[model samples]
Target chain A: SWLPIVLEYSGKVALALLTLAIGWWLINTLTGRVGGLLARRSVDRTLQGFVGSLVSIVLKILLVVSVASMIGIQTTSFVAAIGAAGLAIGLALQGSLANFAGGVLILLFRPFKVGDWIEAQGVAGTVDSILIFHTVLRSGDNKRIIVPNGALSNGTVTNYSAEPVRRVIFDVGIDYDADLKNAQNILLAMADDPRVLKDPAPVAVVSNLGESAITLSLRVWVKNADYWDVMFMFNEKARDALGKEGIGIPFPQRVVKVVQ
Target chain B: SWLPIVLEYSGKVALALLTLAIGWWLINTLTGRVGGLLARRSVDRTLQGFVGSLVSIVLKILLVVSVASMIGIQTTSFVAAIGAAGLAIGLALQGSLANFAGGVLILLFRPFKVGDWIEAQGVAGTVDSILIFHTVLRSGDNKRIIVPNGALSNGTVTNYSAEPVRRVIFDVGIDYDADLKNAQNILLAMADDPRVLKDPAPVAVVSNLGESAITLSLRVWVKNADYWDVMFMFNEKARDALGKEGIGIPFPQRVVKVVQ
Candidate 1:
């Protein structure tokens, strides 16, 4: 009786083994194909590997389950249990999954790159690293900030360093009684520096009349790298020129009525 | 012979059914206990349900395998397949799981809450919604930002509205020829407003001596809500008082040498 029973199940076992071998090979081949496609499309290296392994594992699990069921094992309950587990895990990891997806979107879209000065999610800094789940930024004061990709991909980002040129605007307050034309001319003359752009031309205009002083706004275009240098140089030059020409820069002026 | 074979299998089938029923009931009981514990610990409502179901599903799967084995069904291959499936799912959802854990940490630690004006992850905004996965922020410009909880929990957050009082500072540049002592006195006089804090005492100090002007730094403490109003009012008053006192707030001045 034992010999006959073994003989009866041997054929099924052989078929199951063959199915397992073929399915394992097929899973590997399919995963490799996907990997090649991902590489060709310039997908992130980490994501490509993760996706490939995940596909392979899933296929392998399915192969095993199929082979077991063919040998007369009950698999319906097993599959249901796996599905339920997946749901639970999914619920628990919802935020992380969103962040990962956001990361993928960022990598694909390339809204910003490392070294770019960007203002996003309320922080402005230079992009340091673009990780799978988050982005790192170096603040002006040398602080490190890690922002989730989910937040970045879904929000507005301002890339300040994207352009080649930037405008340097300065509001210089002067005495109301000072020579306006001379002061404007002095500011315009400071823009003769080589760093300042020529096409747009430097402009000095009366921007505001305040309680005590007249505000002159001097705007000049400069290469992005020369912005701070040009601004500081012009500031010093304007002050020196205006002072030598006997034009006074006014302080806060107020009229006080003393009641005794 | 046929009757003996049927009799031999019937007992195993009956026992397996009994085990399945008992195991299902126990799983429900265990899940309820966990749910109760989570509720008592003030865990998030969504998380409690998710965890309870996860535990129940895992346990039920084990029970199903045990019952099937009792009925003489092979389960080794099925268990291996399920384990592999679990690993695959875990890998695919690693980020989501991390985020979920981060959400739990945020909920438990209470770092920031809805309506709090928080600066984190390079973004500053009022927290709009604190969900299980991500936090929603309404930016100053009325834009909505959805940030994953993981970044917030891991990063340094600046809570601007955390404190009741803030300092208002102004750098008031005065003409070199103007009255320094009188300007300081005038600036101090502006702090007489009711909103300005008295304990700290308003301070006016010579902060900088520039190329063309001397800078006076004025500092006053006020309630957070009254900061901007107090700042604007003091600025206007300082200008008016300095002007009335014949103390000049200077313009940008420089000593420009004309070389022919």
Candidate 2:
């Protein structure tokens, strides 16, 4: 009886040892393979490492639990406890989990990048850096803004500097008695400045006929960088040109009937 | 020798059983205490439950490991494996964890609430709903905006609708040759409309003497809702008054030097 017991116990110990060695080897090989696969798929380096370690650790825990059971120790309660703890942490970290998922999507989709001027979440600024949890923006006024990636990825964003060229519009109000043709010609000629684009020739059109003024709209296209400069120059130059040509840029006016 | 061995094994079994039973009682008591504490602190109901369960599960696991060790089971590897798994998960969920912390702060501090018109992260809208992870906003244009709590809590937010009254400013330009005193008087008179606030008697001052025109700034305080209505009305009324008084709101003027 004693000899039989010894043989049984020895077999259990031997099996446990063999399983432990094999499990370690398998875990290493599996994690290595996963890391290689992630690398090939061009996953972020930080994410690749985290995923590989997560897989390895989870597998190792399972192997330990299995070997303990094989050696005749009850592991059901242990496993249950682990699962319960995971559930609690998962619930508590729900928001964080959503943000992480959003961050991953951002890195993959690449909607906007650093240096891009974007308007979203009520702030417009140049993207400074895109981090895992938040995006940093340097506003036009030089203030730094931090936006959560979850909100950013899910929300609509307008990329102002996405295109190379942008259109500049100026509504020039002329006196109703002023010569409309001359005003239009004067506005169109001012757009011939070097900054204005030549391909899409500048347009001057009567946009609105109001109570006491005829509104002429001057539309011009320019390189994104030149937009402000061209706009300012046109504002001043147009006033000068119209004045010399006797075309008046009127003030707010109304036809008031005089009762004598 | 057989008697001693039997007694030793029985003693170990009894101790493990006692430990398990007592551990369960202690874990239950501890979790209950924690739940009560969280309730008193006014923590979110969802968070209270999560934290209570998390504490209970962790304590139970530690008790299980202690019992196993007392019964001659090797648990060093088990503890190490569990710790490794925790580290991996923490790394992967770092962003989510940060967001969760931010959410907690938001719930506690209450920077904004539902229906407030807030501008943050480059979006301006009325607060729709405040969820654990994200805050929903209904924009002025009726589009839905989702913002992350982490960003909302950290960034600079402008609450446009916070104040009951707002000041409306308009720069009314007049012809250089016009009667400056009469023009100012006419503009200030328009602020007598019922919508304009009386406490902060309206102000009309010569704010700027520009290249070709004299700019009179009319500043009036009104209820937030009446801002736009008052602004439009004043624009039209100011022109009529000036026109009836024969005060010409000058056109853009320049002394033409005809180089022959």
Candidate 3:
């Protein structure tokens, strides 16, 4: 019986050692590949290291705990300590933890990144940088805006720069008697700039007939980067150009048939 | 000896049963009051019952586990099973869990309720109903909008109906030759309607001077309920009234100075 007990203990020790050795190698190899894959996708260096280390450490802890318990060492106390500590930390840092998690998700998923123009939480700006707690934005007026990552992650995000091309719509109103065809042709021809796309072709249509004016709406597709420049000219230059064609711009007019 | 042992085991069993009985009664009483408290606050009936029953069951389970372990019964397997089940459920229902927590917070805090016109997550509408997963809204144009509760709860909410009174502003532009004093008087006179409040007093002032027009702004305070109706009438009536006063609303005009 004593000899059998010795043999059993020896077998347990051998198995535990083998488990740890194999587990360590596998966890390291897996973490290395994951980190490299994230790096390949241009994930931030900070997050790639943090996530890889976190994964490796957690796996090692689990492996060690399982192997220890297999050799008749109690693992309940260690697990309990980890669980209790996690609960306390989670409670204390609930808000910050959420923001951190959001940052992690955003960085990993890359919904929007630095230099991308995005609109979220009523603020439209170019993303300056993304921190663990907040996202920084450079507003159109050159103001530095700081938004909490929690809201940015959970709320709707309009990524204007996500695609390479965007549509520019101009609502141009002319006098009621203005030549609709002439206005449409002039509006369409204005979109012939090199920045504007040619495949979709510019469209000009009569959208609404107001009491004061006829609304000619022009829609054009252009490179995303040229949106603001194109929009600026569409209002001033387009009106001036249409005026050369004898299309009159009217004031806010109404037909008042007064009934006394 | 055997009789003594039997009595000892029987006594422990009896005590465990008593623990269960008392624990069950206490938990039920506590949960019933909690359910009633939530109900009083107009929380969803389903959530009320769900949280109450959830609280009761978890407490009962803890009671059973502690009582069993106290009597030298092994509860490791039972505890592990519960932990694993909880983990699985948490992972599977993370989004819904957040929404449920948000719903509970909203019900408790009363940030907004049904019928309140609120702006959140970049959308503004009158809140139709608050549900466990989503908030229903009737948009300004009578379209139905559904928003997730999680984002609304987390993001900033602008509740227009939270206050009893709201300010309405009307910007009117008149031709440069129009009399500023006369235009101001006409705008000031239009606020004599019963809907416009007098406590703050209506204000009409010169806001801006443009190339072809002088912008006169009228500000008035009215009850929240009268905002839309007052706004609807303010536009046409102000323009027509201004026109009668010889305050012509001019077209957007710019002098093209040729530079050699």
Candidate 4:
């Protein structure tokens, strides 16, 4: 019995070390691969690093706990003791738990990653990073947004860069009589305006047989980084191009079809 | 000494009553509001409600402790003793601590609500509800995913429905001789298919002047729900619409400039 007890203790110690090593390796391997995949796919590097680190820490914690139990420690007693400690600590540090909870939530349900334009807890910006205690954002005005993760995660998180491609649809209506062909040609040129992406080549289609004028849907491709820039560029160029073609981008129709 | 003692005791009794009353009121108010919100939002109502209750308990405990100290109890020693007790309990409830952490995080940072399609922590589907102790997700195959809040909060979360609108874009390159007007007409008619929203009236624009043919971009608008449907329909119809116009949707071309 004594030997068994000793052996159990020894096994526990070994288990703990093994757990740590295995956890470390698993976390590193998985996180690195994930980060690399995202990085190659143009994911913000900061987010990749943060996510990688988070995975590593979580794995380590789980491993340590599992190892401790394997070593023959009474998990129930240990838990009871920790619960008492947590209650006492919770009593003394009310706000800490709230913040901790928030941080963990933000990390888990990542509303936005670094470089992702987002709105959270009523603040809008490109998310910069999620820290252990808070989430940092970069505002359009270059201001830093530091929101408590607890508030952010417990609240709403609006992410704009969640998708691979964004649609750039702007209506450039030609005057009812202006050569529709000429106007469309000018708008088509805007797609090649250096800034747009080509894989998903932009297309201009006449979507509606409108009463007042024809409507064309122009779809373009751009990296998430250039979303805003490309958006503005297309609208501005279309306006100039339409004017050059003597085509008026008319208002919505004002037609009255006589019913029987 | 007796008079002073009596007065202090009377004050303590009043303080205790006030604390109890305030705690009860706060509990009811927050609990009810949280429940309503979770129910309406289709989040894990029961779990979030439990979280609300747990948080309320934390608040109540702090309030009671404050009341005891105000009533001239040895708040410091009481807190210390409770801390000691809690430390023991914390050890015992370490596993629960992970769950609690996850729960708190889920409640704090709501990544995906019920009925939202999201991908995170290697799990993808509609988030059923975030419970106090864990998060419930309905997978693509109708399987229920219950993830501990601690793990959920500590891991990554991706919510796909947090945006107002997503753009759908596609490209179609036509033969250089295919009248740009005919192509534009087809595209415009398609945009008016009632699927694209009116406000963001779909438009087709010639994106770039490719070497062999002119490329066009078709962009449309749809509510988040209708996005995929509209996109798929248009992709299918773009080919048909162009064909109806007698426009050849040509493949890659390498015109030979033979020296005569």
Candidate 5:
């Protein structure tokens, strides 16, 4: 008798189905709106897609789980199904999961930004994109790197281009017999090159008076972009200029005093 | 006579079909082993599947064409059908195609490795896996990053965890009347912390003789792992110790002279 009643009064079942559909629609609508806003704010396309998709996924997961329970489905079974599915997917996508974790970290605390020239994990490149899952990089050598955020989050992130000015330091050694004042003035003159920051006024310092030589550390700050240019320009100019001042850029001397 | 020969072959069309099946099986047996070997060497799964299917298709196509030609089927119609199918597939998968091309670039040029800490396109993370079409990352704050390689390969990336040592720099401006020698000695002692590497001795130098105060810049190198802890410990200690030395940390001041 109840079987006949169940078959005839399918209206409740239809209502449950309608509830599920509305839940899906409502969640999708909200996710779409949020995703659109995030996409507009996004600089990288992958990031845009990922942000949008991630928001959509969260809403979708919530909607499905909620609708299933409301429709008289066992909550435990549904959760178990999702967990199983997630595990299967995870096993299939082990690498993507790592990168996804990395993406969340990037959005939260920014250690580095795009256009910053930095080196990490033995690769040097400019930041190209930050997505929800992976970071894209274009290297100085014209290569592309796709790094997952998981391993990246667990390790160190060194940002080289974070500073406006970079200090270039070189230890120039003179022979122990070299003139003390002469080393300073000559090195100061070398640092006076227009490439160096003038307001900061580069310092050619006498750091250690050694047994073999006088160690002068000449340092100059230059704009980040001017780093390589100044490095190469000064390397050539300073070496020649020091020679004129009778300064020997000393080397490690291996002197053997043999006891006969 | 060719037409007559075709008529004679029609008596055994089912036999011809069986012959083709056996030939295809033999070909698959030999090629399947080769495919398995290539797959074992870590070839792209999608590519491997596509290639295997493509080879099978080509063999099947040859077999079909030969049989059809014997039965006098038009070859031009087959070509047109193939072109139409390909065009439809291409149009349907434009986004996926872009991802595929990006995947190709990632395999060709790797900017960061699996454990590299990289920031690009607004996201920073470590690479977890590189697939034929996408990559995975783990974020710093315990999240997953899955990205399509196509978008990443075309963007910029900054790698931070590349080097063994990182230099942490900061400036502490002292009051104009502060004893510079005492300040220098205090900083040197702090720099001599065992955590700081001796090879790249921490250098604290008078960076700027500002209008109202003298600015000292300290550059210290520490192992990447120790950078954050060292920075936190050093900053707190330096600030407290410098305060006790009768040296006042200077703030930004503007002095203007007007002539009437």
Candidate 6:
């Protein structure tokens, strides 16, 4: 009777061992395929690694627990302990985990992509890469800025390159005595450059009548790639052309009458 | 024997029902006391609801499970299902959960308090209220901005009112031909005003020599409450004082050369 009881227990032990071995192999195979599938879809390299490891870990934990239960062990307490441990660890890591979730949302939404110029969270830069926790941006000054996805996703994002064309607005002021019409003509001439689009003719309108000067907004449309260069070119040319035409850009001056 | 057995079963049933009723009452009382204690401590308003409800629900669930076990009912599968469901819900709400955790940490650390001027997560405002999910801020323009605590705690927080004194920095530019020593002396004289702190002895130094102008920095310390008011006062006074002394703040200028 003792031998029979021992044999029966051994059979159960052997079956549990088989489950562990086969389950381990199956887990590796499944996780590997998932990684490969994501890679094929051109998912971000960083995310692929994260997903792979996450899948592998979850699968292994479940497998080990199930295998232990198969060997007639009570797994209720074991699972309860795991749950408590997980909750504690999860709370501690929730900040980073939230950022990860934000990153995922950003990827899925495609608000902006790498190499896109965007201003968000009070920083303007070209997005260099998107990682699980944060995004890397290269500033105009060539400095790198790391922005967490949680903040970036929550804040307002202004993407400059979202459109093919950009409107260049320059509020140029002229002296009180300067002829506004002539200044407008000079701006129209500057907008005739090849970089400036012609469909929507550049307009120079008196937008504001300031105390010291009249404000003219030179509104022009340019190709997205040529925005800054065209802006700078016209700024310098406008100043030079205005000077040659005897138009003055005034400075704030006060006529002080000293009463003694 | 049959009569006694029936009575025994009925007694067990009565005891289970009694446990359920008493357990429910106990959970409510304990949770209410916890809420009262935390309220006395002035814990954040949002967190009180979250913690109170959580404690109450968890305690009640434990009581129910214990009552079932006392009546000789199997609860292993029931508990496992609860654990799985809870974990799923927790993962789904990870974003807000993380924010709550962050809010708790902020309350514990006291990095900034309600009404304190704080700059973090790209927003600078006076904290209107601290909540579990987000913090309400009243901007200088009186715009209400809601910032998620998840991003806030992860970033560097600059609290303007952290100290009693704040440094006021001003870069005053003068024409290249202006007398450098005279300008420096004028700023130093202004710094001697009663509103400016005397311990540090306000400093005026030539900070930068630009292409067309010389930049002098006047640094002073003032009480935190008077920072903005004193800044505006000094700026206006400095401008008036400079004009009286015949010092000029030059406009943008460029010299054109003729090549014929």
Ranking by lDDT: 1, 6, 2, 3, 5, 4
Model 6 per-residue lDDT tens digits across residues A175-229? 6777888888887777778888877878889897986668878898888999867
Highest lDDT against the true fold, candidate: 1
Tens-digit lDDT track for model 5 on B201-241? 77666653444466666777777678778888877887898
- Whole-model alpha-carbon lDDT for candidate 1: 0.76
Off by more than 4 A, model 1: A1-81, B1-260
Candidate 3 deviant stretches above 4 angstroms: A1-260, B1-94, B258-260
lDDT of each: 0.76, 0.74, 0.73, 0.65, 0.66, 0.75
Q: TM-scores, in order shown?
A: 0.48, 0.48, 0.43, 0.37, 0.39, 0.44
Write down the DockQ of candidate 5: 0.02
For residues A72-106, write the lDDT of model 4, one tens digit per residue: 32233333334565464354333446767877876
lDDT of model 4, residue B174: 77
Q: What is the interface RMSD of each candidate, in Å?
A: 14.6, 14.4, 14.7, 19.5, 23.2, 14.2
RMSD values for the candidates in order, in angstroms, are 14.4, 14.7, 15.1, 23.3, 23.0, 14.5
Chain B, per-candidate TM-score:
0.66, 0.65, 0.64, 0.50, 0.58, 0.67
Which of the CAPRI classes, incorrect, acceptable, medium or high, describes model 5? incorrect
At residue B142, candidate 6 shows an lDDT of: 100
Candidate 2: segments with Cα more than 4 A from true spot: A1-100, A103-260, B2-81, B84-88, B91-114, B246-260
lDDT by residue (B216-240, candidate 6, tens digit) is 7777888878788878877887877
lDDT of 2 by residue, A1-260 (tens): 58868976987798689878987998999899989988999978989877998889877887788688778888778777666655565557656655756676566545677898878878889999987678999999999999887667656566666557777878777775665667788888888778888877877766534545767778887887887798889778877888897877666654333433
DockQ for all models: 0.06, 0.03, 0.02, 0.05, 0.02, 0.04
Q: In model 4, which regions exceed 4 Å deviation?
A: A1-84, A87-260, B1-96, B108-110, B154-156, B162-166, B171-185, B205-216, B250-260
What residue runs in model 5 are displaced by over 4 Å at the alpha carbon? A1-260, B1-70, B87-116, B126-135, B150-159, B173-185, B206-215, B255-260
Candidate 5, residue B19: how far the Cα is off, in Å: 7.9
Which structure among the candidates has the greatest DockQ? Answer: 1
